[PDB]
Write a protein that binds this ligand. Sequence first.
Ligand SMILES: COCCOC[C@H](C)N
Ligand SMILES: COCCOC[C@H](C)N
Length: 341
Amino acid sequence: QKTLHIYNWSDYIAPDTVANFEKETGIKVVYDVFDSNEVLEGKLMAGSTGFDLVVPSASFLERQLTAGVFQPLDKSKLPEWKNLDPELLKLVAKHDPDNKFAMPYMWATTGIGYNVDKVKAVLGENAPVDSWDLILKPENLEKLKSCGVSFLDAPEEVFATVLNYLGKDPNSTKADDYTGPATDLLLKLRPNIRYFHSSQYINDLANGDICVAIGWAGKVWQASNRAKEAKNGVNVSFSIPKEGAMAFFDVFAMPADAKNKDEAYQFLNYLLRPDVVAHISDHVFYANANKAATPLVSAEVRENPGIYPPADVRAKLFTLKVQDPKIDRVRTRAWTKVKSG
Ligand SMILES: COCCOC[C@H](C)N
Ligand SMILES: COCCOC[C@H](C)N
C-alpha cells in the first residue's frame, strides 16, 4: 500500500484534488496544512518533517537550500515541466538556481482586504482603498479601529511592505531603517490593530467582524466568495495598492529524507496537468504558475486583476530578498516589539 505525506498551505487545493489523485493512482495521501512560512521553516530546520512534499514560499526556500533540507528534483521524472511559465520559472530561479529544487505552484500578492461598505462608511466614498494609506496612515487606522483591523502574522512581508510605503528599499539592508522609521510607524499603528494572524482574517472579513486586513489576495477573495455564498450582505474586496506590493511564489519541494519519492513525483506530475491546476485555481482564487493552464481557468478567476495582474501592475510589485544575520536579528526583534501583547 503506497502512501504519501503532503504539507501544504491551508485552503490551497480543490476539495476533490486528492481524492481524484488517490483513485487514479491507488496511493493513500496523508494531508496536513499550515499558514506560516515560519512554522514550516522551523520544522525543516529542527529535524525530519516526516513529509515527502512541502510548500514553502520561494524566498524562504532560498534560505532553506543552504541547510540542505531538500533534495534536487529529477527533471527526467517531471516531463510536463514545460507547462510552467518560463518568466515565472526565471523569477523563482533567483531563489532556486537553475530551478533545481522548487516546482512553482501558486503565486499572489500581499495587499489589503477590506469590507467595502464599512470602510466607505468610516472613511467616506473616496476612501483610499487604492493605497497603503488606507491602513498604514495612523489617522485612517484610528478611525477604522472601531470596525476591526488585522495585520498578517508574517514579519518579513509586513516589514518589506512598510519599508516600501516609507519610500525605502523594500529589502533595505540598513539596520536604522528597521529600528527607526519602520518600527516608529508600526508602533503608532499598533494600538489600532486588533490582532496579528495569517488565517483568522478570512472568516472575520467574511462575517463582518473586521473591516480591513493586510492579507494575501487569494485568501481575501475566498472570504469575499464565502460572504457571497452565505448571502450575508457582506461585501469584501482586495486591493493591490498603487505604491506597489510584495509578490510571493509558493513552490513544492521535496525534503532530503522523503520516504515515498516515486509517489511524490507522481503527485507533482499530477499537478503539472493543466486541467488539474486550473481546477484548483477555480476554487482557491489563486493564480497558478502553469502557463498551459491559464485559458482553462474560469473567467471569474482568470480575468480578476487582483489574481492575474496585468503587466502594468506586475511591474510595480517587489519580491523578498534574504537578509543577512544582522538585519534578520534586528527585524525579528522589532516584530516582537510590535506584536507585544
Ligand atoms: C508572468 O507572471 C510572473 C510575473 O511576475 C513579475 C513579478 C511579480 N514582478
Ligand atoms: C500571559 O498569557 C498571554 C496573555 O496575553 C495577553 C497580554 C496582553 N499579554
